[PDB]
Amino acid sequence: PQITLWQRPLVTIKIGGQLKEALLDTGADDTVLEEMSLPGRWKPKMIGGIGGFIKVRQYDQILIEICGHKAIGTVLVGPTPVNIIGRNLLTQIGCTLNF
Amino acid sequence: PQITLWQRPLVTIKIGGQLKEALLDTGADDTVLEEMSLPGRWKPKMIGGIGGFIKVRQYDQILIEICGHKAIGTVLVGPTPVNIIGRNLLTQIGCTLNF
Numbered sequence: 001p002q003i004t005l006w007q008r009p010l011v012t013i014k015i016g017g018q019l020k021e022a023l024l025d026t027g028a029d030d031t032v033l034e035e036m037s038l039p040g041r042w043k044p045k046m047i048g049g050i051g052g053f054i055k056v057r058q059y060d061q062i063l064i065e066i067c068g069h070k071a072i073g074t075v076l077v078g079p080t081p082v083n084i085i086g087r088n089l090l091t092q093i094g095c096t097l098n099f
Numbered sequence: 100p101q102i103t104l105w106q107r108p109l110v111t112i113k114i115g116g117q118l119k120e121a122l123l124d125t126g127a128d129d130t131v132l133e134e135m136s137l138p139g140r141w142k143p144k145m146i147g148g149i150g151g152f153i154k155v156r157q158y159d160q161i162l163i164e165i166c167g168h169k170a171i172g173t174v175l176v177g178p179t180p181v182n183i184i185g186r187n188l189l190t191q192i193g194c195t196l197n198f
């Protein structure tokens with residue numbers, strides 16, 4: 001679909017048997033979800049936003065459905081205020097900016 | 100134009116007589132620039148997200164030019180990693196997400 005930005009670009013995701021809402025975010029290089037239960041092994045890692053810095057767990061090769069489209073990729077899990085779909089996966093479902 | 104997200108969506112802006120680059124960012128509600136010379140007066144505001152929170156100055160009805168397009172709106176200036184153009188100006192220049 002096409003999405004204008006008068007509202008926040010929130011979409012439904014399925015990950016790990018669970019339904020979530022998540023933000024499509026061209027400003028984020030990676031994907032980060034709020035604390036959840038993922039099976040499947042992880043490495044610790046850090047990311048930075050506006051007010052500094054967080055420690056997240058990295059899980060690789062995770063399947064995610066984003067608004068009905070599938071993707072597989074790296075997903076961080078951690079104390080983000082909101083779930084964020086970043087550029088690693090937006091490229092896999094074909095997402096562009098237009099103006 | 101049509102921007103793909105294999106690279107960060109950086110664009111050239113002109114503001115306050117100065118040329119800059121900025122990130123187009125659908126996951127930011129606001130526009131925030133690194134510290135820089137702006138004329139006028141402003142209010143204390145605070146924003147946050149992933150590392151926590153920051154202190155920014157708020158200047159209203161700033162003219163900005165984003166890849167050739169002019170827009171007027173609120174700009175925050177502050178200790179951000181990179182210049183962000185948020186949804187408040189993306190709507191102005193007719194910007195959509197598409198997949």
Ligand SMILES: CC1(C)S[C@H]([C@H](NC(=O)Cc2ccccc2)C(=O)NCc2ccccc2)N[C@H]1C(=O)N[C@@H](CO)Cc1ccccc1
Binds near residue numbers: 126
């Ligand atoms: C301030 C940023 C725009 S710039 C920095 C970015 N890091 C990342 O994108 C990693 C990342 C991944 C996921 C989340 C955050 C950060 C970077 O520096 N990228 C160049 C870079 C390239 C190579 C090496 C090193 C750095 N963080 C971004 C950020 O917090 N964006 C928020 C707004 O969209 C995100 C947000 C949205 C809603 C609520 C809260 C936060």
Ligand SMILES: CC1(C)S[C@H]([C@H](NC(=O)Cc2ccccc2)C(=O)NCc2ccccc2)N[C@H]1C(=O)N[C@@H](CO)Cc1ccccc1
Binds near residue numbers: 081124
């Ligand atoms: C973590 C966020 C996705 S969630 C929070 C957001 N705040 C804002 O959008 C204000 C704002 C504006 C600009 C920047 C940061 C924050 C919010 O809570 N939005 C609902 C809301 C609305 C009104 C009131 C309360 C809550 N910040 C975002 C964020 O940092 N995104 C980064 C990734 O794109 C941004 C980024 C990109 C690259 C490098 C570094 C950072």
